[PDB]
Amino acid sequence: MNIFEMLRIDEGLRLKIYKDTEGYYTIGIGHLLTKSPSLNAAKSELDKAIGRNTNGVITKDEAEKLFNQDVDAAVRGILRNAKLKPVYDSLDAVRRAALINMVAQMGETGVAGFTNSLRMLQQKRWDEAAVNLAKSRWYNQTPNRAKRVITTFRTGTWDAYK
Ligand SMILES: [Cl-]
Ligand SMILES: [Cl-]
C-alpha cells in the first residue's frame, strides 16, 4: 500500500465533472475544481487545468496527471507549513501518509487547525490522538473515511485499507 493507492481508494475515480460530499464540483481523483455553484465556472477551471477544451470530461491519463500534481503539492505544502512540518517529520512512513490524506481532503489550513491532535500525534500518544481526532466536523461528516485515517494514525499499519 502507498499514498497513491490509499487516496485512490478514498476518493474514487470519476472522469466526468461531479459534486463531492460538500456539493463542490470535482473531477478525477478528488481534484476540487471550484467552490462556485456555477457549472460553467467549473468547466472553465477544468479546461485551464488540462490545457484543452474538455467539454467536462477527461481521460484516465489526464485524471492521473492531476492526481500526481495534487499529491506532490500536498506534500510540498506540508513541508512549507510551520505547523505541519514538525509533525510530519516526527512520524513514521505509514502515519505520514495519513497526514497527507487529511491534507488532500481538507487542505493545509483545515488540518493545521487540529492543534490539539497534532500535538498528541507529535507526542506519539496514539490512542489519545484518535479519540481527539474523532471529535470533529470531519469525523461527523465523513465517518467512514475518517475512521480509516484514524485507525492508520492509531496503529501505524494499513489494516484499515485491507
Ligand atoms: Cl490544476
Ligand atoms: Cl465517509
Curated annotation (Swiss-Prot):
Result when mutating D20 to E/Q: Loss of 99% of enzymatic activity
Q: Where does substrate bind?
A: L32, A104, S117, N132
Induction summary: Expressed late in the viral replication.
> Which cysteines does the record link by disulfide bonds?
none
Q: In the UniProt entry, which residues are flagged as the active site?
A: E11 (proton donor/acceptor), D20 (proton donor/acceptor)
GO process annotations (BP) = cell wall macromolecule catabolic process; defense response to bacterium; peptidoglycan catabolic process; viral release from host cell by cytolysis
Q: What is its EC number?
A: 3.2.1.17
UniProt keywords, alphabetically: Antimicrobial, Bacteriolytic enzyme, Cytolysis, Glycosidase, Host cell lysis by virus, Host cytoplasm, Hydrolase, Viral release from host cell
Functional summary from the UniProt entry: Endolysin with lysozyme activity that degrades host peptidoglycans and participates with the holin and spanin proteins in the sequential events which lead to the programmed host cell lysis releasing the mature viral particles. Once the holin has permeabilized the host cell membrane, the endolysin can reach the periplasm and break down the peptidoglycan layer.
Protein name per the record: Endolysin
State the organism's lineage: Viruses, Duplodnaviria, Heunggongvirae, Uroviricota, Caudoviricetes
